[PDB]
Amino acid sequence: THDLVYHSKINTFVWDVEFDIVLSDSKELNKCYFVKCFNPYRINGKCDFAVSSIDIFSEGKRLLIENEFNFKITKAVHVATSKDVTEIVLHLSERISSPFPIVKEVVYLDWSHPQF
Amino acid sequence: YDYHFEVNGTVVRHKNKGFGYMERFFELKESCDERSKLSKKQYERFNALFNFFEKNGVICMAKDAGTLNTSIEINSLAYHGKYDVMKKFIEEQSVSIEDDYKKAFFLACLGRWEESYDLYSNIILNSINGCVYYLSQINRYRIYQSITQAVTQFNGLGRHYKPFTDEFLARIEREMTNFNIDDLFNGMPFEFQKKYKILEFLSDNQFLYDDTVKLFELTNKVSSDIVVLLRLYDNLRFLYENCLWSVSFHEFHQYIRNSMSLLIEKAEYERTRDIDELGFGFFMEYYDFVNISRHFKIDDIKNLERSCSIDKIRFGEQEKIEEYLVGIAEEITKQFSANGMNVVFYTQFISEAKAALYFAKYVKLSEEGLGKIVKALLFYFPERDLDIGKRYVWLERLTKCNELPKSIISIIDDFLVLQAEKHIDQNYSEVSSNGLYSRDYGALIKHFEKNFISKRLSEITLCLTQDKQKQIDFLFKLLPLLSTNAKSHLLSFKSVENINDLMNGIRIGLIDEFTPEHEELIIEYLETRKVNYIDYMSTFGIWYFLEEINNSKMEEFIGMDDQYDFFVDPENFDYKKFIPSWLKNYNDKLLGKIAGNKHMKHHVIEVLKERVKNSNDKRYLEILMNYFI
Amino acid sequence: CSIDKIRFGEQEKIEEYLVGIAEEITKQFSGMNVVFYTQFISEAKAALYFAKYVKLSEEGLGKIVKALLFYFPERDLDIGKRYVWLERLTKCNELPKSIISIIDDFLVLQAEKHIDQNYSEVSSNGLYSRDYGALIKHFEKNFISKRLSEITLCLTQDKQKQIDFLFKLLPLLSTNAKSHLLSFKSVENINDLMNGIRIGLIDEFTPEHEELIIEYLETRKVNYIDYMSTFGIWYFLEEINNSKMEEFIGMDDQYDFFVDPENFDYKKFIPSWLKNYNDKLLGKIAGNKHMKHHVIEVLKERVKNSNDKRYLEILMNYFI
């Protein structure tokens, strides 16, 4: 946990790890991660409430979430050091109490906005 | 060291105990009567001296200094990015060996490093004052270093490119084997080492250590700024007008970065100190814009933007900056619309083009120049450097000083139709590093027009069938741009049967108004969750609080999700269950609506105050300060 | 930054370094090396300034305080700056009896200097020996200075400077000393008014005091065609109810801000003013409801654009 970074603008953790997870439909995914984009100035519609948009990437290609994405992490693996970090992932997820506590990378779209 | 020559052009007696020849020269210059006293040879020598001193910006002594005008003016095609003119100059036949030195520099600046090395070798052959010979040796060593580093980087890096043939690499490795740049100056004729001592620093590994250490004066908190800026201009003019390739090296780029960043930070510090004391400085011009574009990375510009208020920095010579940006756009088009891609040139040029188009946010651009820049950015900027999201960010930055005209809206519409055409293929998927996709361009168009209907996308939609699914779920995110007929045709390809389809429709913008059947579906899901009690709950609560739902039969499910109970009825919520991190997930609209509720406002104000006092969190502080939630 | 919340280790070594600096200060200004002094005085000044965050023993604090008060040159550290340093030295060390005695010696020396009519204290930041006496009285309430009382009992009308200087230090004097001083000295000038309202001689402004304030305001008006902010503040806490104050707006911005908050032009407001006001004044400004939102905007701008954390403290504590 030496490259683990806590981003506090949106209370998440940037960690270079992959997740093997199972949803509520028994579907299995391997070597998947998440990328969060903090967009406070995004041009929202009437029904958008989140300040961040999250994209799930498995095997280097993103997923189109058509079903409910309620999922449980079965095995989290740190890429740099192949040591299993699943227990730390669940600990942080229980502590953080935010959607997708651990994220591969956080993109900040505030400073590059014309309204910044 | 007989005199100091200051960056403003004033001379000061420093260390000569003999005659004041500089003062006498200036006295001769000011008044013509004593000029006739000189001999004819002395008269023409004085004329040459006067031309040299006025060309180098040396006016008079400090004691006689008056209204001193210090305007930077670099006579270099390489500095101004006149790539077409540089190519024309290289195409021409070089009359002199000094034209060959300029040609070799221009070849280096255009990425043609093999030709530049060959020309420098030829100049070294034909050059034995011997000042071009020494400069050619310096620049050939520099270009050999550049070639070596580029070969290393290309071996390290998205497609394997071989710009330099291995025979050329071996030839220059053998030619420059055991070549000592340090021994170069000492091996020159003893007259050269006397007349051209000032050139010896060009053989050093580092030559900007002094200028960098004097940058600490900009970090003092107790003019230095003018001295630093004029010193930077002096270095730039010397390295570019004299066609020295070390101007492209990381040391010089880092020096320019450090000096400009510290100057802007210092100006910001003076502005804030004055505001603190006076209760209500750096004025950027064409040369500063070009320096930042050429030498700053995007991360460096982002550090500048977060550290200081660049919007409080007014920009001058905006017609010159617009010409620079239009030239950058034209070169982007030439490099990528055609097959003119030079990989060596591309590596150095793409960073400057990116930085220039990023910094163009602060520049007012004419409609035609904005059209050129926007078209080049949207269509001819390579996707390996600027993906769909990054290119959208760059484009949207251009609306800060130029509210979207009709021509730019048409260009973005052309881009959207091209993206839709790319979605004929089922395999094609947009790759974005920012999470921003083609939907964001249409969102921007509708933001700046509110009534724009794109005819070509409507035509594409009306031609759509059920087979090419990719086009339907692409154009669904672009629904506001379509016409009524196109909207009706598209809406037939999706169903809202179950609650998951409803969530998909809201997320992709399929439906923006909640019908009673959607409310019934939401209630069905809520009843199922309540029954199975012994992710969408917060979303439904937020929708009810945002007046997106007026069903009023939701209070049955209070007590399962804390956020849902908080949003459905703020008055009856117990705020020991409130999690402050919730406020970090809401956007501007939701936070503002929470602030204006007249309920739960004081509870969340106390929560934000506790978070600010306990943790000194900048996000919580700015949330509490902006919306006063 | 909050350097007071940063822990300081090896405090015995730091204290020994500070005591060595104090020893060298005493040595140089009791055989002065002018070349050494130029480089050494900056380091000694910064060390005694940064010593606020270091806990010092009674003996080491005594050495440092004595060197600072007596042997630190006035050319670098004026009496106000010296008071600032000494008061900063009380953050981690509540004033012991020995330090109180050292400051009393300093005050007695100041009076002995003031026996001459020509001598006058120079202070860039406006703090004088009366502030040393107030600092002494802050930590122990029932402190009577025997030596200054002795000088007071010997006072005559001829030594007017001594009379006024000891009037500024009235709380330190004994009952007989203050009785003799008040027999010799009476409040009849505006500076006398401020000194009396500071030391505690007067609690409520008599009509004569308000008449003196009005007279000074007529003088300021006729000269116009820094006691201004004090008068504006005094009228703002409703302690001055003469109600003629409003005839005198336009000289300086702080008076206008305090007397007529609705009519003040807040583009001419200075944020640093908020750093000078005390707890009660800041609370009154917050509750005035006439300038509250304007100074909220000023405080928010200062929080956004300045690194001074005092503005955030003010905004959070009082919501001014």
Side-chain angles (χ1 to χ4, degrees):
Chain A
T1 89
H2 278 261
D3 48 38
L4 179 57
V5 172
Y6 173 68
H7 289 250
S8 79
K9 197 127 51 151
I10 39 64
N11 59 329
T12 82
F13 283 97
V14 155
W15 212 0
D16 163 348
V17 301
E18 322 272 57
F19 301 85
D20 303 334
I21 62 158
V22 285
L23 319 97
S24 38
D25 49 14
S26 100
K27 185 159 70 211
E28 279 198 23
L29 317 94
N30 277 52
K31 288 326 92 193
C32 87
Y33 61 66
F34 325 91
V35 166
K36 264 220 207 189
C37 307
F38 174 72
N39 216 350
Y41 311 130
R42 186 242 202 212
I43 313 196
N44 301 110
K46 226 45 163 190
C47 316
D48 318 301
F49 63 88
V51 86
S52 327
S53 78
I54 173 145
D55 287 15
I56 310 101
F57 297 79
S58 32
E59 262 83 12
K61 64 110 208 183
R62 88 184 274 237
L63 302 178
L64 293 176
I65 297 322
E66 74 281 52
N67 47 29
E68 188 162 342
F69 208 66
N70 265 95
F71 70 112
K72 306 278 129 62
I73 288 87
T74 61
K75 163 194 206 58
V77 152
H78 185 32
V79 155
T81 86
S82 316
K83 146 183 200 291
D84 182 5
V85 302
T86 316
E87 58 277 60
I88 311 163
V89 159
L90 288 304
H91 161 218
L92 298 179
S93 325
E94 302 326 305
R95 165 180 266 296
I96 278 294
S97 268
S98 102
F100 312 90
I102 298 101
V103 149
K104 179 72 148 14
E105 98 200 59
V106 167
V107 184
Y108 290 97
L109 283 174
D110 46 61
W111 58 53
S112 39
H113 207 269
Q115 291 171 13
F116 187 64
Chain B
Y1 302 87
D2 287 341
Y3 298 83
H4 325 123
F5 289 76
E6 314 292 351
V7 276
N8 41 317
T10 46
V11 192
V12 156
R13 189 136 175 182
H14 167 231
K15 252 187 68 165
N16 77 310
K17 319 284 184 256
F19 194 61
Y21 52 89
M22 269 334 280
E23 292 92 330
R24 190 52 208 154
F25 168 84
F26 284 127
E27 277 155 31
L28 261 183
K29 168 200 160 198
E30 302 298 335
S31 79
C32 155
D33 51 347
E34 318 117 315
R35 230 170 292 169
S36 289
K37 310 179 174 355
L38 315 149
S39 148
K40 149 165 297 322
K41 147 187 269 203
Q42 266 76 51
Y43 193 59
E44 47 137 281
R45 288 185 161 202
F46 176 88
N47 281 348
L49 290 183
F50 164 77
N51 290 348
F52 173 94
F53 277 120
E54 94 159 334
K55 187 174 127 163
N56 272 247
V58 179
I59 30 257
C60 63
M61 315 271 319
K63 292 61 63 153
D64 285 57
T67 303
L68 276 211
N69 157 273
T70 51
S71 87
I72 175 52
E73 182 252 341
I74 305 196
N75 298 265
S76 190
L77 293 172
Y79 181 82
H80 291 262
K82 295 310 196 146
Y83 300 124
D84 271 358
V85 197
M86 290 159 69
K87 284 164 195 148
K88 287 177 219 142
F89 182 77
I90 295 163
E91 278 163 38
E92 279 167 31
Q93 162 76 21
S94 105
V95 288
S96 34
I97 216 213
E98 287 87 49
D99 270 9
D100 270 344
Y101 181 79
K102 215 207 236 177
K103 270 193 184 41
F105 187 60
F106 285 0
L107 288 156
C109 285
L110 289 170
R112 299 149 75 165
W113 290 354
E114 161 161 14
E115 317 197 34
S116 184
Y117 181 97
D118 297 346
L119 199 31
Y120 275 131
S121 279
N122 174 265
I123 295 156
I124 286 155
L125 277 187
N126 311 12
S127 69
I128 11 191
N129 59 157
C131 164
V132 158
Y133 166 83
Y134 170 81
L135 288 192
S136 310
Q137 292 262 355
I138 295 290
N139 274 359
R140 191 176 66 161
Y141 184 61
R142 286 337 167 182
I143 202 86
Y144 159 78
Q145 286 187 300
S146 268
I147 289 166
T148 305
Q149 293 154 21
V151 158
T152 299
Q153 273 131 42
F154 288 151
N155 290 355
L157 300 149
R159 174 259 280 251
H160 176 250
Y161 258 119
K162 260 207 41 183
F164 314 113
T165 65
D166 224 310
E167 52 245 38
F168 170 77
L169 284 186
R171 169 166 74 86
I172 68 161
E173 191 67 45
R174 139 180 63 260
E175 288 197 29
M176 309 264 321
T177 206
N178 274 315
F179 176 91
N180 218 353
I181 192 78
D182 314 317
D183 218 292
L184 170 65
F185 190 77
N186 295 321
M188 302 289 303
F190 68 72
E191 224 156 63
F192 177 90
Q193 320 189 30
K194 192 203 48 212
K195 304 175 149 169
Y196 296 99
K197 184 100 218 326
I198 58 155
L199 292 192
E200 189 179 2
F201 86 103
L202 291 164
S203 341
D204 294 3
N205 290 351
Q206 295 153 351
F207 67 106
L208 301 162
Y209 50 80
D210 187 52
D211 317 276
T212 295
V213 177
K214 319 209 144 310
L215 284 184
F216 276 125
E217 291 285 298
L218 299 167
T219 74
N220 286 355
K221 37 241 332 118
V222 155
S223 198
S224 70
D225 326 303
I226 261 309
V227 161
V228 162
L229 191 72
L230 291 189
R231 196 212 304 146
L232 173 133
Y233 287 158
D234 224 30
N235 296 12
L236 272 161
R237 207 182 180 195
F238 180 79
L239 287 197
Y240 269 107
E241 296 215 349
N242 281 318
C243 297
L244 294 154
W245 184 235
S246 59
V247 90
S248 76
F249 275 37
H250 169 77
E251 203 219 356
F252 188 71
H253 282 234
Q254 203 182 18
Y255 158 71
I256 294 264
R257 237 139 52 205
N258 286 343
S259 15
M260 290 294 312
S261 300
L262 288 176
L263 280 164
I264 290 152
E265 290 166 30
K266 162 101 181 281
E268 168 78 8
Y269 176 80
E270 319 283 277
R271 199 193 110 254
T272 72
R273 275 300 104 198
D274 286 353
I275 292 176
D276 212 26
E277 300 152 2
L278 275 35
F280 293 94
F282 199 80
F283 163 76
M284 272 209 224
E285 316 232 56
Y286 164 80
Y287 282 79
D288 308 298
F289 189 97
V290 175
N291 294 347
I292 292 180
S293 316
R294 177 159 311 141
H295 306 92
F296 280 64
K297 260 67 189 64
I298 297 299
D299 266 25
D300 303 318
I301 310 194
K302 276 160 177 219
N303 294 354
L304 261 194
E305 292 181 318
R306 57 105 191 131
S307 97
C308 329
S309 320
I310 305 264
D311 341 49
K312 264 102 172 204
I313 304 194
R314 88 193 155 291
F315 257 105
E317 322 211 79
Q318 267 175 4
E319 74 285 333
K320 279 210 225 165
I321 294 169
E322 180 182 351
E323 176 186 9
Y324 171 68
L325 292 164
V326 159
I328 285 226
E330 285 168 5
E331 181 74 2
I332 279 293
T333 304
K334 285 184 206 109
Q335 284 284 295
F336 304 103
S337 171
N339 201 352
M341 203 261 192
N342 185 323
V343 49
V344 194
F345 180 60
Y346 158 90
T347 317
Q348 66 210 357
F349 170 67
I350 210 59
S351 64
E352 164 167 10
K354 281 228 297 173
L357 296 198
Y358 190 78
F359 224 48
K361 152 202 191 173
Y362 309 106
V363 171
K364 166 64 198 165
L365 302 163
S366 70
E367 173 151 334
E368 166 224 290
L370 188 61
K372 274 137 186 298
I373 288 150
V374 159
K375 187 148 185 329
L377 162 84
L378 284 194
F379 295 103
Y380 310 107
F381 224 105
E383 275 269 333
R384 28 170 191 291
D385 304 295
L386 227 51
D387 44 77
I388 199 90
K390 260 203 224 317
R391 139 179 14 239
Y392 171 71
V393 161
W394 262 240
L395 155 78
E396 156 211 71
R397 280 176 61 103
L398 292 187
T399 65
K400 180 245 201 175
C401 284
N402 332 280
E403 315 285 77
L404 266 204
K406 288 294 334 193
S407 38
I408 312 310
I409 275 173
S410 148
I411 303 174
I412 307 171
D413 174 37
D414 292 12
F415 181 80
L416 288 175
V417 188
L418 209 78
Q419 289 300 307
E421 298 182 359
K422 295 200 198 180
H423 280 66
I424 277 287
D425 195 342
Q426 289 313 291
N427 323 331
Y428 181 68
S429 57
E430 286 168 341
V431 193
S432 195
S433 52
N434 286 20
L436 300 171
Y437 292 88
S438 207
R439 168 254 169 222
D440 286 278
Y441 302 79
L444 180 73
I445 286 176
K446 278 311 244 152
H447 179 293
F448 272 104
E449 203 81 334
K450 286 142 308 213
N451 288 296
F452 176 84
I453 282 87
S454 98
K455 302 342 199 263
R456 286 130 79 201
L457 279 188
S458 315
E459 291 170 12
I460 285 199
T461 278
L462 291 152
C463 163
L464 263 180
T465 88
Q466 203 98 34
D467 160 51
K468 37 211 173 170
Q469 183 66 33
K470 226 77 166 64
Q471 278 236 52
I472 309 100
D473 37 4
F474 172 86
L475 286 135
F476 253 121
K477 285 169 270 203
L478 296 180
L479 196 127
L481 296 150
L482 308 192
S483 40
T484 86
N485 272 337
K487 270 191 256 292
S488 301
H489 189 332
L490 213 53
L491 285 204
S492 85
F493 291 86
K494 286 283 182 189
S495 82
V496 70
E497 314 285 318
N498 64 339
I499 186 83
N500 263 257
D501 288 7
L502 178 62
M503 285 322 265
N504 275 255
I506 279 54
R507 147 164 57 80
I508 79 190
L510 194 170
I511 177 53
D512 208 82
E513 160 74 299
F514 271 113
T515 64
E517 42 272 64
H518 299 155
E519 292 185 314
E520 265 186 321
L521 211 52
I522 278 164
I523 306 266
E524 175 186 344
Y525 180 71
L526 284 189
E527 300 317 89
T528 332
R529 269 209 87 139
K530 162 136 84 143
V531 163
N532 301 14
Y533 175 41
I534 67 271
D535 166 45
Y536 310 107
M537 273 222 65
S538 326
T539 305
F540 301 151
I542 294 188
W543 282 342
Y544 186 102
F545 154 84
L546 270 185
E547 301 299 62
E548 305 285 275
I549 290 174
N550 201 6
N551 151 263
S552 183
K553 203 184 99 143
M554 320 258 255
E555 285 74 10
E556 101 279 344
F557 207 2
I558 304 197
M560 208 285 248
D561 203 73
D562 289 313
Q563 190 158 196
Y564 180 88
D565 318 332
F566 161 67
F567 270 108
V568 163
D569 54 333
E571 141 184 298
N572 287 318
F573 184 51
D574 185 17
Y575 290 84
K576 330 294 155 188
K577 316 261 213 68
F578 192 101
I579 307 206
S581 324
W582 293 349
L583 296 151
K584 288 182 159 176
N585 311 329
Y586 312 153
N587 57 256
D588 172 345
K589 165 188 44 82
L590 183 51
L591 291 171
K593 190 79 28 183
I594 294 195
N597 196 234
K598 194 90 146 69
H599 288 15
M600 81 195 153
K601 150 113 154 183
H602 37 46
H603 300 101
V604 300
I605 265 184
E606 301 312 314
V607 145
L608 285 170
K609 282 220 314 162
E610 196 263 1
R611 287 286 85 210
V612 171
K613 295 190 226 103
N614 280 55
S615 59
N616 192 24
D617 200 292
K618 259 46 209 153
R619 183 57 184 143
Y620 282 131
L621 172 58
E622 105 175 281
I623 273 164
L624 164 69
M625 263 195 327
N626 294 354
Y627 323 91
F628 262 112
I629 305 142
Chain C
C1 314
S2 285
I3 301 187
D4 43 284
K5 271 123 168 205
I6 295 174
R7 105 175 204 76
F8 275 65
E10 321 200 75
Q11 264 179 14
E12 265 93 17
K13 281 214 232 157
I14 292 173
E15 174 180 354
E16 128 164 65
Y17 164 82
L18 286 165
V19 169
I21 274 188
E23 284 165 9
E24 187 72 13
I25 282 280
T26 302
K27 277 182 223 123
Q28 291 271 303
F29 311 100
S30 88
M32 197 252 253
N33 192 322
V34 83
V35 168
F36 177 54
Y37 150 92
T38 67
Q39 5 141 289
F40 169 69
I41 212 59
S42 211
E43 152 150 29
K45 212 176 165 211
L48 299 190
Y49 194 72
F50 212 55
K52 149 172 181 185
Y53 306 108
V54 171
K55 165 84 202 335
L56 310 161
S57 48
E58 205 182 351
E59 143 167 275
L61 176 64
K63 300 196 198 176
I64 289 152
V65 160
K66 165 125 192 157
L68 164 89
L69 284 189
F70 296 108
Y71 314 106
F72 220 104
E74 175 103 1
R75 149 180 57 257
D76 301 290
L77 226 54
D78 3 313
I79 205 171
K81 255 181 189 42
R82 171 184 330 247
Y83 168 70
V84 162
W85 267 233
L86 162 87
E87 188 267 314
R88 282 174 56 93
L89 291 182
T90 56
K91 197 265 262 162
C92 283
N93 332 291
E94 272 51 78
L95 220 50
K97 252 69 166 317
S98 21
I99 311 309
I100 277 171
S101 280
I102 301 187
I103 310 172
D104 200 69
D105 299 1
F106 174 81
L107 289 179
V108 169
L109 180 91
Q110 286 323 280
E112 293 180 348
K113 300 188 163 194
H114 274 229
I115 198 43
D116 167 35
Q117 304 323 279
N118 320 128
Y119 184 66
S120 80
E121 280 163 344
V122 181
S123 145
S124 36
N125 65 116
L127 300 165
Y128 302 95
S129 333
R130 76 155 170 291
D131 286 296
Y132 294 79
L135 182 72
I136 293 186
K137 268 292 204 293
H138 183 308
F139 287 94
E140 83 159 318
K141 225 62 64 183
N142 32 62
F143 171 81
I144 268 68
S145 149
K146 288 55 73 193
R147 298 145 57 185
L148 283 165
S149 318
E150 291 166 12
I151 322 191
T152 316
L153 289 182
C154 153
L155 256 170
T156 75
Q157 205 281 328
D158 193 29
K159 26 209 169 178
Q160 173 75 9
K161 288 296 272 314
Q162 207 87 336
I163 308 173
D164 70 47
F165 176 85
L166 266 47
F167 177 76
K168 302 246 199 43
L169 292 167
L170 200 47
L172 305 168
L173 310 194
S174 51
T175 36
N176 286 10
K178 56 175 81 142
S179 305
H180 176 199
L181 190 56
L182 293 182
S183 62
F184 255 114
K185 169 114 188 181
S186 149
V187 38
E188 70 216 19
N189 159 304
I190 188 53
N191 229 59
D192 288 73
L193 188 36
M194 335 264 273
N195 298 305
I197 203 46
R198 263 161 74 62
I199 66 200
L201 204 54
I202 118 198
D203 307 23
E204 320 100 302
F205 277 16
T206 71
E208 304 204 18
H209 305 142
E210 324 216 18
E211 279 153 58
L212 249 182
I213 298 159
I214 299 278
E215 166 203 344
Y216 176 83
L217 278 164
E218 317 322 272
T219 324
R220 184 59 180 157
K221 267 286 271 303
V222 304
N223 286 42
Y224 177 66
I225 274 76
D226 38 37
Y227 315 71
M228 281 277 88
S229 34
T230 314
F231 295 148
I233 294 171
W234 272 343
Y235 182 90
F236 179 81
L237 299 312
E238 310 280 356
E239 331 161 317
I240 287 183
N241 15 52
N242 171 281
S243 211
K244 205 193 139 47
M245 294 286 72
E246 320 212 10
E247 275 63 32
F248 309 100
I249 89 173
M251 280 68 111
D252 74 322
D253 311 286
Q254 211 160 354
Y255 190 164
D256 314 0
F257 162 74
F258 272 105
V259 66
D260 74 357
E262 57 282 320
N263 293 339
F264 180 54
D265 180 21
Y266 295 48
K267 281 54 82 203
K268 295 165 50 277
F269 186 94
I270 308 268
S272 338
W273 295 345
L274 292 162
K275 275 150 55 189
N276 308 344
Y277 309 148
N278 54 286
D279 165 36
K280 153 158 211 272
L281 183 53
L282 288 179
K284 280 328 191 70
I285 297 190
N288 189 227
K289 85 94 188 161
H290 262 254
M291 59 216 160
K292 159 153 203 159
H293 57 283
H294 307 273
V295 297
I296 291 263
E297 298 301 300
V298 149
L299 279 172
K300 288 193 337 180
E301 184 265 322
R302 280 289 86 194
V303 172
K304 291 168 184 147
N305 293 102
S306 79
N307 269 259
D308 203 337
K309 57 150 194 331
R310 178 57 188 152
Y311 297 116
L312 186 52
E313 290 174 26
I314 289 165
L315 179 53
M316 296 279 300
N317 295 340
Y318 315 104
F319 259 136
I320 318 197

